[PDB]
Scaffold this active site. Structure first.
Site, PDB file in Angstrom:
ATOM      1  N   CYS A  41      16.673 124.477  45.783  1.00  0.00           N
ATOM      2  CA  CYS A  41      15.048 124.919  45.558  1.00  0.00           C
ATOM      3  C   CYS A  41      14.466 125.726  47.038  1.00  0.00           C
ATOM      4  O   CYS A  41      13.913 127.153  48.030  1.00  0.00           O
ATOM      5  CB  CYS A  41      14.016 123.739  44.532  1.00  0.00           C
ATOM      6  SG  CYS A  41      14.227 122.522  46.027  1.00  0.00           S
ATOM      7  N   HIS A  70       9.964 119.497  45.865  1.00  0.00           N
ATOM      8  CA  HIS A  70      10.245 120.595  45.496  1.00  0.00           C
ATOM      9  C   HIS A  70       9.796 122.197  46.466  1.00  0.00           C
ATOM     10  O   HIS A  70       8.565 121.357  46.987  1.00  0.00           O
ATOM     11  CB  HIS A  70       9.923 121.162  43.919  1.00  0.00           C
ATOM     12  CG  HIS A  70      10.453 122.569  43.498  1.00  0.00           C
ATOM     13  ND1 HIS A  70      11.670 122.428  42.911  1.00  0.00           N
ATOM     14  CD2 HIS A  70       9.487 123.310  42.592  1.00  0.00           C
ATOM     15  CE1 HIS A  70      12.434 123.418  42.974  1.00  0.00           C
ATOM     16  NE2 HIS A  70      10.188 123.929  41.845  1.00  0.00           N
ATOM     17  N   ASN A 121       8.356 129.414  40.444  1.00  0.00           N
ATOM     18  CA  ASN A 121       8.776 128.747  40.828  1.00  0.00           C
ATOM     19  C   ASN A 121      10.801 129.168  40.927  1.00  0.00           C
ATOM     20  O   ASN A 121      10.689 130.885  40.095  1.00  0.00           O
ATOM     21  CB  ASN A 121       8.618 127.652  39.528  1.00  0.00           C
ATOM     22  CG  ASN A 121       9.915 125.978  39.971  1.00  0.00           C
ATOM     23  OD1 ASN A 121      10.678 126.666  40.600  1.00  0.00           O
ATOM     24  ND2 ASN A 121       8.949 125.831  38.351  1.00  0.00           N
TER      25      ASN A 121
END
Ligand SMILES: *C(=[N])C1([N]C(=O)[C]([C]C2=[C][C]=[C]C(Cl)=[C]2)[N]C(=O)[C]SB2345B678B9%10%11B6%12%13B6%14%15B%1272B632B436B94(B%10835)[C+]%11%13%14[C+]4%1562)[C][C]1
EC number: 3.4.22.-
Length: 254
Positions: free
Chosen positions: A31, A201, A221
């Site tokens: 991520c 994240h 995302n």
């Protein structure tokens, strides 16, 4: 400048196709690397008037940046942008599209949601090795496919500063704290209600808006297009919700 009530990077710079692309980091804790190469891909196009219109390689950054953390085990944001400035990053699409210098070696999968891909599950791949060679069908040498930035910086923990940065210079990378209730997100404006912290994240903030007066950030995302609102989600804006305004990292090409 004057901050509009809503803003969408995808609509200001529709030539830059990367801005509206949702990627998938797969069974890898990358991520940090995805929010980075995503926003650098965007900024390369925005700040060069459309001249560089590319997809920067997530595996190049993931595998080669030793100062960025431990690859698929997680990483750090500021250093990824420093790496881009100092060493640059080659091109590379998803595994499925297998384009550019170094495409992603891992397949799409579903991240705690329902869809067409296989479930990711809990297992994590080992960090791929730093190859520094393009795939054979790609016609540029690694060393010369490198796209570098000029600066890298943190953005002030202030809504308006983050908004001005996005609107002028393009989408940014941001960190936020993940709680268990985030994994059940399907749609709407998210905010932490239930659940214990699972970590952090790193994602790409591309805009903001307001729905019945509720302000939100619009965020891409890296769990593929089946997750959330077509790969995106929205989160409360203005209250540092899960520290969404506190870990903003970006950079410029010139
Ligand atoms: C994704 N996929 C994930 N996450 C990550 O990576 C994170 C990002 C971030 C950062 C900061 C802040 C925030 Cl909010 C977010 N990261 C983490 O978690 C980290 S990991 B690690 B660091 B230090 B360096 B190397 B790296 B490794 B450990 B130690 B820590 C060092 C080591 C994954 C999920």
């Amino acid at each position: 400048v004057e901050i509009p009530s809503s803003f969408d990077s995808r609509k200001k710079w529709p030539r830059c196709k990367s801005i509206a692309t949702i990627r998938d980091q797969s069974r890898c804790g990358s991520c940090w690397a995805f929010g980075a190469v995503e926003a650098m891909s965007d900024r390369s196009c925005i700040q060069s008037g459309g001249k560089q219109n590319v997809e920067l390689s997530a595996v190049d950054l993931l595998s080669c940046c030793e100062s960025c953390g431990l690859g698929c085990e997680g990483g750090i944001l500021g250093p990824a942008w420093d790496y881009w400035v100092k060493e640059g990053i080659v091109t590379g699409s998803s595994k499925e599209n297998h384009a550019g210098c170094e495409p992603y070696p891992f397949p799409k999968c579903e991240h705690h949601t329902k869809g067409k891909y296989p479930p990711c599950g809990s297992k994590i791949y080992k960090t791929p090795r730093c190859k520094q060679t393009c795939q054979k069908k790609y016609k540029t040498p690694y060393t010369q496919d490198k796209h570098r930035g000029k600066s890298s910086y943190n953005v002030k923990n202030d809504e308006k500063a983050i908004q001005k940065e996005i609107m002028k210079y393009g989408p940014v990378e941001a960190g936020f704290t993940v709680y268990e209730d985030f994994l059940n997100y399907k749609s709407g404006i998210y905010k932490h209600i239930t659940g214990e912290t699972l970590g952090g994240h790193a994602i790409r903030i591309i805009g903001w808006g307001v729905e019945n007066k509720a302000p939100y950030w619009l965020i891409a995302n890296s769990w593929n297009e089946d997750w959330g609102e077509n790969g995106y989600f929205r989160i409360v804006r203005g209250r540092d919700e899960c520290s969404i305004e506190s870990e903003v990292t970006a950079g410029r090409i010139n």
